[PDB]
């Protein structure tokens, strides 16, 4: 633990500074350090953790796709042999991406998920677990691809089950989970019908619960509902 000598509160403060500076790798390292203090995370702290790693892995995913596309072109019929470099460098980026995913899954497994008893924490972390398995799945091509996919599904499904029992249909965490699980279905599980059904049902059940909310909660819920709608527009 490179952050082992820094106070928890200082790590959180520095994570917030890092976010303002758009230094997401630093933000992620500070939040990793905070998690490794062993105390449970507050709502705000969970959001900092997620934002940091989401930004880091996002850069790597975008880079991977660029490189993958080039590599695929280099293997078309009529493309000139450019040598091993494209593959080597796509592998380098892929391996770093996988390391980031393993790091996050490691924090969730040691010991964020097992100590999370409230619905809002447990659903948040299990959604994250599904998400980072999904990012692994996006780059997986080996004999482990099926098990990675099944790990994503399993985490998403446990999260869905708790969210349906314990949260209202407008809960932004619940909505965000459904959004992400629907995308999992669509393009990881090759289940577009399931994707569409989940997104529709989720949208419709939130719509019918909006009347219960404050103006501020209404804004939070309708933001994610619009994402469901955006995908449904592309899918139907």
């Amino acid at each position: 633990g490179a952050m082992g000598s820094m106070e928890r509160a200082s790590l959180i403060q520095k994570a917030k500074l890092a976010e303002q500076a758009e230094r997401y790798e630093d933000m992620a390292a500070f939040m990793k350090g905070a998690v490794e203090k062993g105390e449970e995370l507050s709502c705000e702290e969970r959001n900092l953790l997620s934002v940091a790693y989401k930004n880091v892995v996002g850069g790597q995913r975008a880079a991977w796709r660029v490189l993958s596309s080039i590599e695929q072109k280099s293997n078309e019929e009529g493309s000139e042999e450019k040598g091993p470099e494209v593959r080597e460098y796509r592998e380098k980026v892929e391996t770093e991406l996988q390391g980031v995913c393993d790091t996050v899954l490691g924090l969730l497994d040691s010991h964020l998920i097992k100590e999370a008893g409230d619905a809002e924490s447990r659903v948040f972390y299990l959604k994250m677990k599904g998400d980072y398995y999904r990012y692994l799945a996006e780059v997986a091509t080996g004999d482990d691809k099926k098990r990675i996919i099944d790990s994503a599904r399993s985490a998403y499904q446990e999260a869905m089950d708790i969210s349906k029992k314990e949260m209202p249909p407008t809960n932004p965490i619940r909505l965000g989970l459904a959004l992400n699980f629907s995308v999992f279905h669509y393009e990881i599980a090759n289940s577009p019908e399931e994707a569409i059904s989940l997104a529709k049902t989720t949208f419709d059940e939130a719509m019918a619960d909006l009347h219960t909310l404050s103006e501020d909660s209404y804004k939070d819920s309708t933001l994610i509902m619009q994402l469901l709608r955006d995908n449904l527009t592309l899918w139907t």
């Binding site: 989401k54 892995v57 996002g58 850069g59 992400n180 994402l227």
Partner: peptide, 12 residues
């Protein structure tokens, strides 16, 4: 790749 909407920072 056409990327669909997922929660949070669209950082990719």
């Amino acid at each position: 790749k056409l990327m669909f909407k997922t929660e949070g920072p669209d950082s990719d």
